Scaffold this motif. Structure first.
Motif, PDB file in Angstrom:
ATOM      1  N   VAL C 101       1.004  -1.175   0.031  1.00 63.51           N
ATOM      2  CA  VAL C 101       0.086   0.215   0.427  1.00 63.51           C
ATOM      3  C   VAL C 101       0.705   1.379  -0.096  1.00 63.51           C
ATOM      4  CG1 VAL C 101      -1.875   1.457   0.995  1.00 63.51           C
ATOM      5  CG2 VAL C 101      -1.733  -1.307   1.341  1.00 63.51           C
ATOM      6  N   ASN C 102       0.884   2.165  -0.638  1.00 58.77           N
ATOM      7  CA  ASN C 102       1.193   3.475  -1.097  1.00 58.77           C
ATOM      8  C   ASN C 102       0.196   4.860  -0.847  1.00 58.77           C
ATOM      9  OD1 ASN C 102       3.199   1.235  -3.293  1.00 58.77           O
ATOM     10  ND2 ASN C 102       4.370   2.480  -1.360  1.00 58.77           N
ATOM     11  N   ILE C 103       1.024   5.360  -1.070  1.00 56.04           N
ATOM     12  CA  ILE C 103      -0.174   6.750  -0.813  1.00 56.04           C
ATOM     13  C   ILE C 103       1.098   7.953  -2.579  1.00 56.04           C
ATOM     14  CG2 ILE C 103      -0.348   8.912   0.113  1.00 56.04           C
ATOM     15  CD1 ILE C 103      -1.620   6.730   1.439  1.00 56.04           C
ATOM     16  N   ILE C 104       0.561   7.599  -3.363  1.00 55.08           N
ATOM     17  CA  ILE C 104       0.805   8.068  -4.840  1.00 55.08           C
ATOM     18  C   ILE C 104      -0.153   9.426  -4.850  1.00 55.08           C
ATOM     19  CG2 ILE C 104       0.880   5.559  -5.178  1.00 55.08           C
ATOM     20  CD1 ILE C 104      -0.511   6.549  -7.994  1.00 55.08           C
ATOM     21  N   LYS C 105       0.895  10.634  -6.082  1.00 55.19           N
ATOM     22  CA  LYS C 105       0.145  11.543  -6.845  1.00 55.19           C
ATOM     23  C   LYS C 105       0.489  11.569  -7.856  1.00 55.19           C
ATOM     24  CE  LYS C 105       0.421  16.272  -5.980  1.00 55.19           C
ATOM     25  NZ  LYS C 105      -1.602  16.473  -4.717  1.00 55.19           N
ATOM     26  N   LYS C 106      -1.176  11.183  -8.656  1.00 55.41           N
ATOM     27  CA  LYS C 106      -0.897  10.853  -9.786  1.00 55.41           C
ATOM     28  C   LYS C 106      -1.823  12.828 -10.188  1.00 55.41           C
ATOM     29  CE  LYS C 106      -4.176   7.313 -11.042  1.00 55.41           C
ATOM     30  NZ  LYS C 106      -5.068   8.387 -10.945  1.00 55.41           N
ATOM     31  N   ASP C 107      -1.613  13.107 -11.280  1.00 55.55           N
ATOM     32  CA  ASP C 107      -2.384  14.331 -12.075  1.00 55.55           C
ATOM     33  C   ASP C 107      -2.714  15.370 -10.995  1.00 55.55           C
ATOM     34  OD1 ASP C 107      -3.489  15.699 -14.162  1.00 55.55           O
ATOM     35  OD2 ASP C 107      -4.786  15.083 -13.970  1.00 55.55           O
ATOM     36  N   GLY C 108      -1.795  15.346 -10.258  1.00 59.53           N
ATOM     37  CA  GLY C 108      -1.912  16.532  -8.445  1.00 59.53           C
ATOM     38  C   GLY C 108      -3.524  15.701  -7.580  1.00 59.53           C
ATOM     39  N   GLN C 109      -3.439  14.419  -7.949  1.00 60.16           N
ATOM     40  CA  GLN C 109      -4.493  14.328  -6.789  1.00 60.16           C
ATOM     41  C   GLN C 109      -3.951  13.178  -6.396  1.00 60.16           C
ATOM     42  OE1 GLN C 109      -8.579  13.795  -9.341  1.00 60.16           O
ATOM     43  NE2 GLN C 109      -6.688  13.237 -10.335  1.00 60.16           N
ATOM     44  N   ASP C 110      -4.519  12.686  -4.940  1.00 59.74           N
ATOM     45  CA  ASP C 110      -3.754  11.875  -3.830  1.00 59.74           C
ATOM     46  C   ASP C 110      -4.683  10.201  -4.216  1.00 59.74           C
ATOM     47  OD1 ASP C 110      -1.927  13.543  -3.040  1.00 59.74           O
ATOM     48  OD2 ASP C 110      -3.050  13.957  -1.738  1.00 59.74           O
ATOM     49  N   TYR C 111      -3.785   8.968  -4.460  1.00 58.65           N
ATOM     50  CA  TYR C 111      -4.444   8.111  -4.462  1.00 58.65           C
ATOM     51  C   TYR C 111      -3.920   7.367  -3.155  1.00 58.65           C
ATOM     52  CZ  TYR C 111      -7.052   9.311  -9.011  1.00 58.65           C
ATOM     53  OH  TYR C 111      -7.200   9.986  -9.827  1.00 58.65           O
ATOM     54  N   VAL C 112      -4.720   6.149  -2.966  1.00 60.16           N
ATOM     55  CA  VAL C 112      -3.965   4.838  -2.619  1.00 60.16           C
ATOM     56  C   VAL C 112      -3.951   3.793  -3.287  1.00 60.16           C
ATOM     57  CG1 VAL C 112      -4.597   3.642  -0.431  1.00 60.16           C
ATOM     58  CG2 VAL C 112      -5.148   5.572  -0.296  1.00 60.16           C
TER      59      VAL C 112
END
Ligand SMILES: [Mg+2]
Ligand SMILES: [Mg+2]
Ligand SMILES: [Mg+2]
Ligand SMILES: [Mg+2]
Ligand SMILES: [Mg+2]
Ligand SMILES: [Mg+2]
Ligand SMILES: [Mg+2]
Ligand SMILES: [Mg+2]
Ligand SMILES: [Mg+2]
Ligand SMILES: [Mg+2]
Ligand SMILES: [Mg+2]
Lengths: 171, 199, 188, 194, 106, 130
Positions: C101-112
């Motif tokens: 499980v990672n906390i990523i940031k794509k397209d300026g949005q936070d995702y799990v």
RNA sequence: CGAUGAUUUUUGCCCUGCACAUUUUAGAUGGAUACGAAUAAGACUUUUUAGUCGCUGGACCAUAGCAGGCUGGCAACGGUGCGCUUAGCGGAAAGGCUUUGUGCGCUUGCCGGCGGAUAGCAAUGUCAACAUGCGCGGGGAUAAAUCCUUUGCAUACGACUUAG
RNA sequence: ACCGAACGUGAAGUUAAAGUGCCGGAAUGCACGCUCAUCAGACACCACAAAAGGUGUUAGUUCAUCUAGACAGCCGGCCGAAUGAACUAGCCCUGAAAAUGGAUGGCGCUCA
RNA sequence: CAUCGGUUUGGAGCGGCAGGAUAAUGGCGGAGGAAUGUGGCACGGCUUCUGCUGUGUGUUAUAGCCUCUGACGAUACUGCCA
């Protein structure tokens, strides 16, 4: 219906054997005296070996409300027929007249049990003197101290079809 | 109760069938009626229920040739029009003339954007439905069944409301000045006499 | 039965300012501000004092009375969200395949970003709702912390994460893998 | 009774009616959706089908049995001389759909596109666009006014372009004139480009 | 002086009818501003004019009139029954009539 | 502070002044149900009525006990001087002006128009200079 | 349903100011009198505590004058109709909403003078907007399509794509 | 073929059976309740639905626990006031599956 | 248009008379009583006791109500008016 309370008194026709038969009285809630005397014979033939042909109506009198502008609570004991069986019930009504409480009762059993006028026997109508005599909450809730309540969402009836201003419901 | 040249009804907040029956009798009796903002009309019952009803309507089509069958119009004005035409003897010449007396629109296009819109209290949702009941907006039902111009109408409605607000602010300012002048000319001989006459 | 009147009393702590106008509740606290529209309910509000608010239903039937304590609870949850916060703790449950499980940031949005769930090559991504903070717990192995002022948003992100990790075509009594909410509490 | 055996329907019900096209020039039913951030560019072009040929090509498709191996493929040649831009149309969003507001034309149109507006060109006085060409007299403020109207009110801008069919071997002398939507940039950017 | 009207505006609404059968000898008239039989009883006995235009001139005029009178009220919403010398043609359903203020009883 | 917007309803309570038939005043003396009340007044008959047939006014007759008889209601009504309180409101004034307008004759309407012309002359003169 | 090109050298066509006469009318007869939103809410004033408004348009505006004539005065320097004129806004079907200056009237804001009869005791007792035609006056412009021959991107025939 | 009523050609009045939101003449009439259906319901003959079920909602019947603190919840206390069971029957829902698209006559209707 | 006669539908119509529990009520007087207990009193939570309020007590006090009743006076309803 629109009802009145009647005192109907009747007796068996006198015989040479019995020259003063017993007088029987009933309280009948009927729209008129023709139905009052009909209901009288209807209940006497349920309670005594008598007929309209072998009996006699002695008196029909309207019983007016004693205090028609005093708010009361009435308990009404009923015996009604459903689609399946016969049931006893007890209900409570708030009104200033005994007749208007019986009228409310007839509307109420028409609405809640689909019980028509012919399917209902009024066993008893009693004015509940004490606040402790009130068993039902839907009328007990109006016997609380300092009762206030608003009437939100007032709908005003218009004389015209079209109105030039926005509707409102304040009140 | 007056006979009007045109009665322009603002359709916002009106129940569909009740407005339809009132408008039907009006146009049958020789009254010209315009209904604007048909996208703001209301139908009682939840949105899903009315959408299911419209899909039941869509089911019905001529089997041997779909082009002959019922023509299911998706625009809110056409939904109101269908309700009215069902209440009109539309297959007679008199019913056809009565239907010529009627106009229905989405939004408030010219020239009605600078005219008076009235309401019909016998058909108003806020005055008719029990305050807990669920209702549908015909604009959402239309979009849900194929109407393509919801966002165009709302863009043009926001532009119209901005212009109408400039109108109202000017009218209120001139009303304030005229009220101050009527206050100045109060307690004059004519004003006292008109007060004794009720004016 | 049309109960004549039913009431509920909110209790407002010292640093909290509820603010109601036309069934739009704005709760302000040390932790921020929360807003809620209640236009779908027929309730009325009275400010008893700065520490109490009466919520009333007049002549309401059974369901309309039922909708009253839910209004109370929603506003109370707003109050405790702006004065204590909300924290949901999720535990990573796996038999064989570790859940990455990672906390990523794509397209300026936070995702799990969930990887390796039951060995799948698929990468699961859950959008992080506005106002909700995700964290990989340091004090506990295989724990995710979902925190925020809004209980609804926090619980819905936690539910999204739990629901996206469902097992298909297996006996879920045996294949107990997933990410589950283990603790529902407050930040403070 | 039911069919004894099942079989699919013959033909598609999505291409009905099987009638002749209303025009020989195929019309763009839908243009690409406009993105403002992109540069101003045309979205279509007109050409003439010349014929088919064959090519040989090295395939780049990993996992295929023809990967990095020569394939022989049919190809189509479309003769496409440059198109000439002669006009611009502005469209307005209405609750009834797009509506053309104004069409602005260039001052000079070639003979091949002016033949488009004639059924009998050889018998004509060839008067098309002569008064309009006079509208450009020394200030072109009518043209500037119409262009400003397009800039102010249009949401969709399309250019009017015609083929140079004299550069093709076809004996037809009428050019083909079509609307090609301009995508990219603001409406003002599109109008300036046109 | 912008207004010269001495009649009340009315409309020819219908014939007297059941669901399927109509009676042309009685017309149903809507008087403007009348919403109850009590209001409509003011107009009982008043004369009614249907004024219309025709192709041919008669004595230099292209305007013709059919005269009638209000006879009784109709229903509960202030419509009245009218009786014209010649029945109003069915095409006039929705056409405007003139409710005269005479025979006056004020 | 909290700043809670509260409703400004009129309540069904003992002492509420109501209009009956849009003409006559009465006060609520006891509540029968959600729908019915018992009303009484100096110029009205003590009766059980439906709340739909009456309009609640913003006036309360203070300190009226529940179920008060006609003598008590009349005495407290005279003491509180409910008639003057009603007649001093814009609602009663509009009702009175409607009645007064309805009693005008044709000559009086002509005079109203003439006086309106004069006042409009004065009003336009004041407005143009201010 | 929209945009756009060209619209007859004919005495035909377009625009425009009148004047006259006609046909039609699903039905003029003072005025379709413009916020938006909520409705368990709005809007005023102080204070966000409280008081007040509505409870229908039986309103508002307009409304006097031979279907509204002819004249005089006073008070104000306003109101209004029409004609030029200035500027701006409005593209959803804008075709309308404002606005500058000017001229000619009227003004019932107030007070005057003269006229109306006989249509006979009622007879719609004829007064409007749309359209078309016709006489004048002033400006303005000066085409195409079809048949025919041809083509074969088409085709039973029409139709279609081309060229002349 | 049912309900009403049986028939010469007319005028006026009143009704029967049936109705009065529009189609349609007549009430968006007055009133007390009930019902919300992601297949509502809607009027005799008649153009259908049952057994069995539902902590949907309403009203009843009979038992039982209750301020000598009932049930629920935190560990007898704690706020305080009602609570539990079985049963009855109104409306609604499940039960409730057929072939062209389609019928409370239609529109449509939800304090109707 | 007027008046009449025949038929008929109406009015926010007006008046007189009779009956009933010789209405029941209501108003006034007397006697009794209670609570969803007014004042007062005794304790409290917020009030510069600012419709303050809650709980107890008891019976008109600085509100009232209920029942029975005594002499009058009305009205509703149903009938009649040649
Ligand atoms: Mg499975
Ligand atoms: Mg398996
Ligand atoms: Mg098969
Ligand atoms: Mg029979
Ligand atoms: Mg009707
Ligand atoms: Mg069953
Ligand atoms: Mg049940
Ligand atoms: Mg069913
Ligand atoms: Mg039917
Ligand atoms: Mg006579
Ligand atoms: Mg007495």
């Amino acid at each position: 219906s629109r009802l009145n309370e009647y005192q109907v008194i009747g007796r068996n026709l006198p015989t040479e054997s019995v020259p003063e038969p017993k007088l029987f009285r009933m309280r009948i809630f009927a729209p008129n005296t023709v139905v009052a005397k009909s209901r009288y014979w209807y209940f006497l033939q349920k309670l005594h070996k008598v007929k309209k042909a072998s009996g006699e109506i002695v008196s029909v009198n309207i019983i007016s409300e004693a205090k028609p502008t005093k708010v009361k609570t009435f308990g009404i004991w009923l015996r009604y027929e459903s689609r399946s069986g016969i049931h006893n019930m007890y209900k409570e009504y708030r009104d200033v007249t005994r007749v208007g409480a019986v009228e409310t009762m007839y509307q109420d059993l028409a609405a809640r049990h689909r019980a028509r006028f012919r399917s209902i026997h009024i066993l008893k109508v009693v004015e509940l003197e004490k606040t402790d005599d009130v068993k039902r909450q839907y009328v007990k809730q109006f016997l609380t101290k300092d009762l206030k309540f608003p009437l939100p969402h007032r709908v005003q009836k218009s004389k015209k079809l079209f109105q030039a201003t926005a509707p409102t419901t304040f009140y | 109760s007056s006979f009007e040249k045109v009665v322009v009804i603002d359709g916002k907040g009106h129940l569909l069938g009740r407005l339809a029956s009132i408008v039907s009798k009006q146009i049958l009796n020789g009254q010209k009626v315009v209904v604007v903002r048909c996208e703001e009309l209301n139908i009682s019952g939840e949105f899903f229920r009315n959408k299911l009803k419209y899909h039941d309507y869509l089911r019905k089509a001529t089997r041997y040739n779909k082009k002959k069958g019922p023509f299911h119009f998706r625009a809110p004005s056409r939904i109101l029009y269908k309700a009215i035409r069902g209440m009109i003897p539309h297959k007679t010449a008199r019913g056809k003339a009565a239907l010529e007396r009627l106009k229905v629109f989405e939004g408030v296009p010219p020239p009605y954007d600078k005219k008076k819109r009235v309401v019909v209290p016998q058909a108003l949702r806020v005055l008719r439905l029990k305050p807990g009941r669920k209702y549908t907006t015909v604009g959402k039902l239309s979009s849900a069944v194929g109407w393509k111009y919801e966002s165009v109408v709302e863009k043009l409605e926001e532009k119209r409301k901005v212009q109408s607000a400039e109108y109202y602010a000017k009218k209120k300012a001139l009303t304030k000045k005229l009220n101050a002048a009527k206050a100045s000319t109060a307690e004059s001989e004519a004003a006292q006499k008109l007060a004794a006459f009720g004016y | 039965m049309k109960y004549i009147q039913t009431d509920q009393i909110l209790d407002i702590p010292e640093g909290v300012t509820v603010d109601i106008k036309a069934r739009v509740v704005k709760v302000t606290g040390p932790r921020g501000e929360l807003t809620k529209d209640l236009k779908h309910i027929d309730v009325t509000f009275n400010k008893i004092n700065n520490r109490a608010i009466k919520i009333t239903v007049h002549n309401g039937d059974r369901k309309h009375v039922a909708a009253l304590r839910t209004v109370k609870s929603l506003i109370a949850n707003l109050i405790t969200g702006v004065t204590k916060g909300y924290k949901y703790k999720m535990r990573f449950v796996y038999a064989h395949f570790p859940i990455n499980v990672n906390i990523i940031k794509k397209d300026g949005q936070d995702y799990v970003e969930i990887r390796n769930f039951l060995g799948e090559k698929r990468v699961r991504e859950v959008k992080i709702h506005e106002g909700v903070t995700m964290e990989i717990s340091s004090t506990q192995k295989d724990e995710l912390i979902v925190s925020g002022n809004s209980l609804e948003a926090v619980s819905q992100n936690a539910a999204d994460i739990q629901q996206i990790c469902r097992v298909r075509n297996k006996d879920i009594r045996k294949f107990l893998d997933g990410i589950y909410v283990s603790e529902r509490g407050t930040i403070v | 009774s039911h069919r004894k055996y099942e079989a699919p329907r013959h033909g598609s019900l999505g291409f009905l009616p099987r009638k002749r096209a209303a025009k020989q020039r195929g019309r763009v039913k839908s243009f690409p959706k406009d993105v403002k951030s992109k540069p101003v560019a045309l979205t279509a072009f007109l050409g003439y089908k010349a014929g088919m040929t064959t090519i040989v090509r090295d395939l780049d498709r990993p996992g295929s049995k023809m990967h990095k191996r020569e394939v022989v493929e049919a190809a189509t040649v479309v003769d496409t001389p440059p198109m000439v831009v002669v006009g611009v149309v502005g469209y307005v969003e209405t609750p009834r759909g797009l509506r053309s507001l104004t069409t602005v034309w260039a001052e000079h149109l070639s003979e091949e596109v002016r033949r488009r507006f004639y059924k009998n060109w050889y018998k004509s006085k060839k008067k098309a666009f002569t008064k309009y060409s006079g509208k450009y007299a020394t200030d072109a403020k009518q043209v500037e006014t119409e262009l400003a109207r397009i800039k102010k009110y249009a949401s969709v801008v399309r250019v009017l372009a015609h083929t140079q069919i004299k550069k093709t071997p076809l004996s037809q002398k009428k050019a083909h004139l079509a609307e090609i939507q301009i995508n990219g940039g603001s409406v003002s950017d599109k109008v300036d480009w046109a | 002086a912008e207004s010269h009207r001495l009649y009340v505006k009315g409309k020819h609404i219908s014939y007297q009818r059941s669901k399927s059968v109509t009676n042309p000898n009685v017309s149903l008239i809507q008087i403007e501003g009348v919403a109850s039989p009590k209001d409509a009883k003011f107009y009982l006995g008043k004369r009614i004019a249907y004024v219309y235009r025709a192709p041919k001139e008669i004595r230099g005029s292209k305007i013709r009139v059919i005269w009638g009178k209000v006879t009784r009220t109709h229903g509960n919403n202030g419509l009245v029954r009218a009786n014209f010398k010649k029945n109003l043609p069915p095409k006039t359903f929705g056409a405007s009539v003139r409710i005269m203020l005479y025979p006056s009883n004020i | 502070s909290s700043t809670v917007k509260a409703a400004n309803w009129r309540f069904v309570e003992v002492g509420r002044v109501v209009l009956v038939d849009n003409k006559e005043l009465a006060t609520i003396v006891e509540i029968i149900d959600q729908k019915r009340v018992l009303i009484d007044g100096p110029k009205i008959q003590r009766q059980a009525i439906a709340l739909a047939k009456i309009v609640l006014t913003p006036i309360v007759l203070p300190n009226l006990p529940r179920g008060s008889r006609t003598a008590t209601v009349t005495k407290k009504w005279a003491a509180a001087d409910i008639d003057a309180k009603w007649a001093a409101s814009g609602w009663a004034k509009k009702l009175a002006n409607k009645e007064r307008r309805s009693q005008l004759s044709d000559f009086e309407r002509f005079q109203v128009m003439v006086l309106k012309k004069q006042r409009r002359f004065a009003t336009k003169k004041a407005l143009v200079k201010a």
